[PDB]
């Protein structure tokens, strides 16, 4: 457990924190906007996961300024996490 494992390990933990907080903040931001569908927590968590994994079906998405702002954080933290693990497994193989 040097640096190339603690980084990916913390990123995975941080990601889960972002997913939980992101789904919570999304509901807070999306409510008050007529037509918004991202207004309940259980499906907001499902949205955050498919957002952080860059899947993004289209069944759920933010339509507000702060809602979309929260979404961007979920994307970046998502790509970084899934990208930091990739760079982690790369360094592992290089050192044999």
């Amino acid at each position, epitope marked *: 457990s040097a640096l190339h494992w603690r980084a990916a390990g913390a990123a995975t933990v941080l990601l889960v924190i972002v997913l939980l907080a992101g789904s919570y903040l999304a509901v807070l931001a999306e*409510r008050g906007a*007529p037509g918004a569908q991202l207004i309940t*927590y259980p499906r907001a968590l499902w949205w955050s996961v498919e957002t952080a994994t860059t899947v993004g079906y289209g069944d759920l998405y933010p339509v507000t300024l702060w809602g979309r702002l929260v979404a961007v954080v979920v994307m970046v933290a998502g790509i970084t996490s899934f990208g930091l693990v990739t760079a982690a497994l790369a360094t592992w193989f290089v050192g044999r």
Partner: antibody
Amino acid sequence: QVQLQQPGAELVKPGASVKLSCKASGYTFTSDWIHWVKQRPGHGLEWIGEIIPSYGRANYNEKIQKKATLTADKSSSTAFMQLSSLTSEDSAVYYCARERGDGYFAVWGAGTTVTVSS
Amino acid sequence: DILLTQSPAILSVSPGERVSFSCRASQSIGTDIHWYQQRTNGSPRLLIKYASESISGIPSRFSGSGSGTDFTLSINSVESEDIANYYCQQSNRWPFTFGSGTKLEIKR
């Protein structure tokens, strides 16, 4: 036990104001939403607004006249609805309901019969 | 805003007979509909959540069905304690909206 305690009635003069309360009991999570529903006699249920005590943000029904201002108190776990400048059209039973942030209203209050008269 | 229409407004039925209430949305809301009950001088009581999912405490007679725009609340063999107003409420899009309500009437 009763999870939402509301005052029995509140007499208001035309043009004055009143502050209804909604004391909560039982499990009070941080993801709880407190809603307020207006019901005139002979009519149906009418959504007024919502508020999450944790953050303090409140939303209101834009389809009707903005006359209610939702506030909360995390200390005593009670929700408040400030009705301003009431007329004869505002005389109704005002319920309060707890939502777990999953859509439905699990528990309703007994309702506060607000009467606007001189 | 999503409009919720309940037809008819009044529903007459003989005792021990199956009855069905109707709730139609102006647009597709999936299964995000909820049924409530309100007797005379009483507060609304959650009967069914999410179209068909039952609530603990509510008798077995109360069932739920429907998806998209059309939804139905059913009572298997209606008895006298079911005399009340039945409302439907959606939670698919903000803001939440209620139905016009349907009053159950038993002809004895």
